[PDB]
Every structure is written in C-alpha cells, then in structure tokens.
C-alpha cells in the first residue's frame, strides 16, 4: 500500500518500544516527523 | 539629572514588548551617556572646577600659559608609541572629560563606568597615557633647551566605577557617594527594564547582535 | 597625473575591502580551476577553487581574510601546472592553473592595481562594458584636432 | 473666473454666447452638471463660444484674516487692491 | 509491504549528527526572573522527578534548555542587575520573556499539571 | 561562438533545464549582436534537438499528449512542453515565463466559469510543486524561475570530488531546513561556511558544470535515449512516462482550495523587483514598415536591466529575508555584516510585511508562510550588456524597441507606440500609489 | 470526508502491520498515536461503527 | 531565402543521414553494447552501417 | 446608556454601584471609594 | 459563578481603596464600566448559593484564574492592563 | 436628470477589484439558476 502519511501521525502520551531488552522512546521521532525513516530503515539526521 | 527625567518620562509610556531593536539600542546609548554624565558631575562638584564644556589638550595648555609657537612646532611630530600612529595634532584635538591646572602641574583624568574595571582602565591608559607621556618628554626637552622658565608636571589618573557602585568610595573617598550610587542604581534598573521588557520578543536576537557589534 | 587624484585613489584602494573573510566572496569559491597539492607520484593535482577552499577551511580553524591568508601562506612556494582537460568551464580562461597561495598573492596585486587604475580610466585605460569607448574617442578627437 | 467675466460682461451690457450642441470635434469650453471643464464634449450640453485655452499664457504678500480664520485677503503691497486670497467655505 | 528491524540501536546511531541544534536567544536577566517566579510560587520539592511523566519531563527540559548557560557562570552580577531593575521600577511578572522559544500559558499549565496546588488559597 | 556552442554541450539536468540553458544562451547570442531571425532559427534548432533527445516531440514515446488529457501547448514546460517561444519573449520576459503565462491563463479560466480542462492545468502545476518540494529549497532560489519541476538522476559518482562525501545528504537537507537564512546570504564563519561549500559542491548543476567535458556525461544521454528510470516519483527512480501518468492521476482528482488559490495568485501576482510588463507591451505593440534604406551605424554596448530594486527598501532583499529568518546569534552577525544599513533592517522588514499584507492576505509573520512565499517573490537582479547600433538610450524600453526595429534584416521598421510605455511596477508600487 | 477516513484506515493498517512484524504494544500505541483530530482508538471505534 | 533554398540541396539530406548514423553509433557506444558486433542500414538499403 | 454617558459623564452608572456592592459583599474595606452621583 | 470568581480575584489582587474614582480619567472609567456592565444584576439578588457553588467548584479541582470567563464580552488581557494602569502596584513585591 | 447623472458617473467609471469581485460573484453564483434556465431554453430544438 502506498500514499501513507507518516508525517501526520501525532504523539499524545508516552510511546515505548522494546528490542532485545532495550527500551526506546519513540515520541521524539513522532514529533520530529521521522516516523517513516524508522519505519522502513531509512537514513535521517537527529541532534545528539 | 534632567536627562534622566526626560528618559523616564519617555519610557514610562511604552508598554512591555513594544520597542524595535534600534529604539532599544539608542535608548540604551542615551542611558549610558546619562550615567557617564552624572559621574562626570560628581567629579565636577568634588573638584569644584566649573568647566562645563570639555576643552582640548591644546586649549588646556593654553590656559596653563604654554606658548602657541612651541605647540604648533610640536604638532608636526608623530608619536612613536601610538598603536595606530596618530599624529600629535589629532591627540591635541580631542577633549578630556575633565582637567585641572595648579601652578606647573596639570592633572588629566578619564572616567568610565563599566563592570570590567581593569579592562576600562587599561583601555583608557593605552588611549591617553602614551600621548600624555610623549608631551611630557617634549616639554621636558623644551625646558632643558630653555624655552620655558619652569618645567611642567603631568599626571594621568583613570578610575572605573562598577555598575553597582560598590568600590566607588574606595577609588573616590567623596562625601557624596550615597546620592550618586542611588542615582546610578536607578539607571541600571531603567537600562535592564527596557533591555529585557519593553523589547519585542521577535527581535531579541537583533538587539543582542546590535549590542555585541556596538559595545563588544 | 595620479597626484591630482590622491583622495579618490585612496578611497578606491580602501574600498577593496581587505578586511572581509577571504572565502566568503564568490570569486574564491567559484568553479575556476586551481592546482591542488603534490601527490605521492610527484605530479601536481588538477583541482577546483571550491575544493581547495574546502580543504583549507577543513585544515584551518577560522576563515582568514586576504591579508591573514597571505601571511599564513607566505612561506609556501608558488606552484603551477597545465590543465588536464582544457577549459571545462565558461569562466575558465587560459591554460595554466596555480596553487592557493599564488592565487592569493595575484589577487592582492590585482585588487590593488585595479583600485589604483580605475580612477584614470576616463582618459588612458579603456575599461570595457561601460566607458570603454570614451578614452579612445577622446584620444581620436585630440589626434584629429 | 467664469463668474467674474460674466459679471464684467453684465456691467458692459452683453452676455456669454451659449450654443447647445451634441458634440464638438475641437477643444471648447463646456459646462456640465459638475462644473466647467475643457476638452471635447461628446454629450449634449452648453458650450460657451469665444473661449480659447492658451497654454502659452503661463514674492511677498501680506494677509488680513477675517471670520476668525475662515476667509483670507491678500495683496502685493500696501497700495495693491484687496482680493480674497482663500476661504474655507467650500463644498 | 513487510519490513523487519533487527538493529534499531545502530539504526538510530546512524542518524546521530551535530550542528542541527535549534539555538534560542537567551535573556540572562529574564531567565532568573522566571526562575525566581517559579521558585516563589511553586513548591518543586513535593513530587519526585523520578515518578514524573517522561512526556511532560521532556517538555519541561526542552523549555528549560540553556537557561543557566548564561547565568550559572555569572550569577551574583546578574542577580544584582535584576534586583536593581525590579526595585528601581515595576516589572510585569508575565510580560517578561526569558527566551524566544518560551511560551507563558503552556509553561504555567504544564507546571500546574506537574505540581497541583490548592485553588482555595488563590481564591479565598 | 555562442550560437555554435549551444549545440554540442549537454547539461543533462533534464528536459526543462536543457531547454532553458539552450534558450538562455540563444538570448545571450542575441544580446551580443545576433539578428532576431538568426536567434529564432537557433532557438528552433536547439528546441528540436532537445525534444528529440528527450522524446518530447509528437511522434515518439515521451509525447505528453499520449499520457495527459491536455493540449501539447498547454502542458507545463517541465513535462512534455513546447519550447518554440518567440525570441522576443525569451529575451525580454524570461525563460520560465511560459509557465507563468499558462498558470495565469488557467486561473483566469477557472474564474468566470468552473471548467475541468483548466483545473486540470492547476492540478498539473500542483503536482509539479509537490515534486519540487522534495529536494533542496535553495535550488528554486536563483537560476531560472519555475513554479515546479521534475528532478532527474545524476549519473556520476559522488566520490569523484574529494570533499563531496564529507556530510551525508540527509545531514545537508536537515541543515538547510534548520538554517534557511543561509539560502540568501553566504556564511562567514568556517563552521557554517564549510557545510555551505559542501552543499554547494553536491549541487547537480555545479556537478554537471564540473563534469561538463567528461565522458561520464554520455551515461545520462544514453539512459534518456533508451527511456530508462531517470526521474523521481516519490522516493523511487521512475521513467518519464510514469511521471506523466502520475501527473494525470493527480490532476484528474484535484480539488481547488482557497489557500492553493492564494498561493497560485502569489505566483501570478507582481514581484518584489520592479518588472516591466512585457506581455501587455508586446500584445499592444504595433510595427510599421517605413520605406527607408537601411543605414549601418557603429556598435555601442548598453546595459539592459530588466529587474531593478525598490528604493524604499534601503537594504537588499536577500539581506532582509535572511535577517528575518536568522534565529541564531552567528546568523544575526553574518546578516549584519552583509547588510549595508543594519539599523534600517527592522524598518525594511516592517515595510515588507505591510506591503505583503496590503497586496495579499498572506502574513509573513509565520515562518512557514514567509519560507514558502519568499522564493516566488524575490528574484535575482542580474544585469546584462546588450550590443546596440546607434543612439539607443540606456533603458530597457530602448533596447526592446531596438530589437523590434531589428526584426527585419533589410526593411526599416517603425514602432507605432513611440511614447514611453514602461510598466515599472512592484509589490510596494501600489502601496506608494494609494 | 471519505478521503480522510481512507487515509486514517491506511495509516492504522501500516502501523499494525509493522507492530506485528516487530514486537510492539498494539493497544497502548493505538491509545497514544493521533491522526488529524482523532486518536487511533477513536479511529478504530469509528471504523467499527 | 535560406531554408527553402537549402531544403532541396544534397547537403541537407547528407547531413540528416550523417545524423542518423551518429545516433546509431552513439547508441552502440554503451558499455554493455560496445564489445559486441552490430549492423544497420539506411536509405532503402543503399547505405549500410 | 450611551445617552447617559454622553450627557453627564460625571455621575457613575448603576453598573459601577452594583459592582461596588458586590465587592462589599465579597470583602469590605477593599471597595472603590464612591463619591459621585448615580446614573 | 465566573462573575463572582473574577470579582473576588480582582478584589484580592488589586487594592481599590487607594485612588479616588472621582479623579480617575473618564476615558478609562468608561471602559471599566463597559467591561463590568451587568455583573451586579446576576449575583446580588442570589449570592450565598452562588458563592457556595463557586467555593465547591474551586476547592475540589483546580481553577486557573486566567480562563474564568464572566461573560461573552470579556478579555482577561485588556481588563487586567486597564486595572493595572488605573491602580498601580509596586512590581518589586511580585519579584521580591 | 437621473439619466444625465448616470451618464456622468458611468463615463468616468474606473474598474475596481471589489466591484469586479462582486459582479463575478453575482453572475457566477447568485444568478446561477436563472442562467441555467436560460441555457435550457437556448439549447432545445423543436421540430414541427
């Protein structure tokens, strides 16, 4: 399926992800409009 | 003084966050001018020298009985220690804030109001004392050659007063410290006020850049 | 002739803006060819002005001015080379490419002389584009008279 | 100026020559509802004859103020005739 | 259609870069004015920061970012200047802006949500 | 020299860019002294060559009419377009003026009556803008003017230049988005200037200029002739036919919006620089043949300027735009250094906002609004030198009139509207008027 | 109105598909993600209704 | 007086033929197609490439 | 109300008096010192 | 209820027994009367029940005194700046 | 007199964006039904 608006996704509460015991906070990704970049393993630039 | 009253009258009618950056800059410049003027006035009344208008170094020497011919001859000379190689004529053109003549001794004082006392002191020294000492050697050589009956003595004293006036009495043990420090405390409030209040939040960066270029 | 135009000559020389950063101007980040550094094989490398500017900016810690850049690279020996591929740019005129310090020195000399020469352009030097015809027309009028 | 010249002609015993035409090919002085204008009128109106627009015809004064500052009269020198310099009683 | 992620830590680390920081113009005096306002009005020693919501904590850190970088190094002089400005003349505790990114309402509502206070004291 | 060099070199940046380069240098040849008829012949030859190379002409695969329900003439230039404009409009109006005229006609047609063939053109323009808003924003700044264009592939490695592979493409994009003031002013400090230069090095136009006389350019030509993946439709490489099909699909189901109408009018409306209205000047002009023998006079070079700067704004438009967009201290220092009148920057910005609000309902206070509308409002102020024969005055009107009298190689031509019909108009011109 | 519902449904489809490919809190995320002016849980409720 | 006169010239058609030949040669110039043989003909089989 | 404000302008409206009464009910000694007339 | 809440707020925040209203500027008095018009007609007749309801609403859950809307023609910013200008307050206290 | 005043006003009439917008709005939206009926009447063929 194409024409998916990942930039329109908004984060209201805390968003958490678990990967091999590693806890990740995806709320800044949603706020930065980089949902698609992490969605399909695509390059991006983030502040440290 | 009355300048502070006019500034306060102009600035009590401005709502917070309604002044353009350039307006804030020139109001601040006026306020620093007022602070410098009130310190000049405290020193004025301390020395009781009613020299309302600043006079040039050549004019001060003329008031000291120095003949004009030797001054004209010296105008052609050049300061060897001047950082910019300015001529003696331009150094005579400039007017110190205050002066005093007592017999053969002339006292020159430059006053600045800033937080960094040492930086202002050294800046005023590198601006004044080189030419002052060159003039001192020139007049000493003239006295040795016999064109003046009595040698002249020159003294340069620079005093910097912090923005809070804590050390103003230490440098200037005057009787009038209280009123002057109260007045100067007010100017700080006014400057800080317009600087961080009447200024617009969309032009704070513009104000910071203009302040850095003008004063730093 | 130049002594009667001292004020304008001084103004023209001072208006060349010797205090601005060297690499902030367009002419020093253009695509004109420029010799690079000596490679391992011993042959000078053909490069571009923008690449050499980037190299110097990467090696240096600040963006120096024209005078500062000349002072920093004063001891550097001037080097020159003939282009690998001719022209390669609409602004590339000539057959030789030099190094960055050489370009800096030639720029200093060229700017100073252009400033000192643009003032007498009304009579002797025919500056193209705007007043090229005027000096030659005056000379021809004097000759015919 | 039309009023002044009309008064002068009335004092002299004649009146303006007025012709009602639907259009004039040349520049003539014509009177409309809004006033007097110069040009070529293409509308049936009143055109004043013997009117020529001559563009080729193209200092210290003292002012006396009356009506608390509503009308002004000026003249060249003390002996000059008095004329109404300005007035605010317009529409 | 179907995508699988096996190295998300390295995926994020590949995105890490410097220079893309949104700096804001700080007002050194105004920052400490709002600091004094918050300290006086609100009791920050009631609820532990550990149990606070990370969603609100991130916003609080973002709105407080870089506040002390201009006032921690120079504190006594800035405090003296602020005291002179606040005593020599009246200053509105709301019109003052610490930095361009600061938003008043949002800051107060977030502070009240994080640190609830009894409205009877404000009213009665 | 320019006429014969217009042929061999291939910019390889796409149909629109190659066509624009050929037309612009034909205009330059006309400026150097070429007759308008020879310039027109050269324009036709270069247009035919580029159309055949890209397949745009009717008779082969890449013809737009086979994939769009719009006339060949009405298709935007970035798509399959007809670059057979008169040399007069190219020299006087500009290069991308065909798109502007098409958009103006489409908006005029959309009013009065609400048809579908014109809303189709509006949808095509919106699709072009959507394609354009996926690359560097400084590409639209400077160079030829365009509403939007299709991006084409770069068939050369990035490792050829030593310092290209220092900052990643995503790094450069995010730095450009964060630091938008550097699109209009050149950074001074090395920290920003190095990134600016690295971004400049990766520019496709500059890359092609650096590889202009290299065998690597044959790659793009062979890919284009074979009709392979050369364009972009979203994050994937696509063929030109796919771009045409996507444009048709987007335009057939496009709904007009009030904000979209305002932005289209922003494109159609006046400019920040005083521009002469060449369209109505040429439409209302008339030339008459006078039976007088041709007289060959000398040659003199005159400065033909088409875009001036409003005198009310004491600073250059890039300086004011960068000052508005500058948020960091060092950006402010750079814009203050570049600006000749730093104290009047706030006044110029206020007048800019007031003029925009007066002529348009759009408010530049919001950073997004000014960011989107600035490139379509500010255009470059490049000056040109045109070789003229006789007493042609140093004004744009005089140069244009000389070109009109120069259409006939043998017959003397007289222009009936001999009065001054200049239309020096800007956004703030109407403000000064009211 | 149909286009917005279609877009919301497609976004939900994609996010759930990825959450199933990985290990994610489907219900928690559907109560946190927001589309337009409607949360994902409300979007699912509307789709059901 | 130029195009109409030169249209009937032999040089016009010769140039068009050379253009077609150059197009074919450029097509063969690809990296894949370079190391293989090829054959083309033009003008009713009169000219063979 | 506009007529009353235009003509007199020296007598406070009944709205201000009612507000003063409300303030007195809430907390006396912090009310507006009223010395003008009504309407 | 919002009327009585905002009235109490104004009562506590500002000291209204300092400057005589007779010598106040008529231009500002007009605007104050406009923004307070009709408040008395809704609360004087029934006050104790309204005051108890206001207490009940404000004590249980928090109320921010910048969102209370006494009537449809009320602006917090304008009313507060008018009251600041009419009745000056020493800003030193707020910051000290 | 009314006719003469109308002629005087109309001879010097200058186009206005607001007036043009109003006329466009009328002729395109307000009188739409009337023009629809007019087009109905125009585009009908009757044979005897």
Author numbering:
A (entry chain C): 1863 to 1910
B (entry chain D): 1 to 216
C (entry chain D): 800 to 944
D (entry chain D): 1766 to 1823, 1830 to 1862
E (entry chain C): 2028 to 2151
F (entry chain D): 1187 to 1620
G (entry chain C): 1621 to 1669
H (entry chain D): 462 to 510
Original paper wording:
Hantaan virus is a dangerous human pathogen whose segmented negative-stranded RNA genome is replicated and transcribed by a virally-encoded multi-functional polymerase. It catalyzes two fundamental steps of the viral cycle: replication that results in the duplication of the viral genome, and transcription that generates viral messenger RNA (mRNA). The interior of the core adopts a right-hand organization that is common to all RNA-dependent RNA polymerases (RdRp) and comprises a palm, a finger, and a thumb domains. The active site cavity is located in the core center at the intersection of four tunnels: the RNA template entry, the nucleotide entry, the template exit, and the product exit tunnels.
(iii) The structure of an apo HTNV-L WT hexamer, determined at a resolution ranging from 3 to 9 Å (overall resolution 3.6 Å), reveals a peculiar configuration of polymerases into a trimer of dimers with a twofold C2 symmetry that had never been reported for any RNA-dependent RNA polymerase described so far. The central dimer acts as an anchor on which two external dimers bind symmetrically. While the central dimer displays a unique configuration, the two external dimers adopt the same conformation as the isolated dimer. In both cases, the CTER domains remain the main hub of the protomer interactions, that notably involve the swapping of C-terminal residues 2142–2151 into the CTER hydrophobic groove of the second protomer. However, some protomer-protomer interactions are specific to dimer B. For instance, the CTER α-helix residues 2131–2141 and the CTER loop 2118–2121 of one protomer B interacts with their symmetrical equivalent. Analysis of the interface area between protomers confirms that the hexamer is indeed composed of a trimer of dimers as dimer B and both dimers A display large protomer interfaces, respectively around 3900 Å2 and 2500 Å2, whereas the other protomer-protomer interfaces found in the hexamer are smaller, comprised between 350 to 1351 Å2.
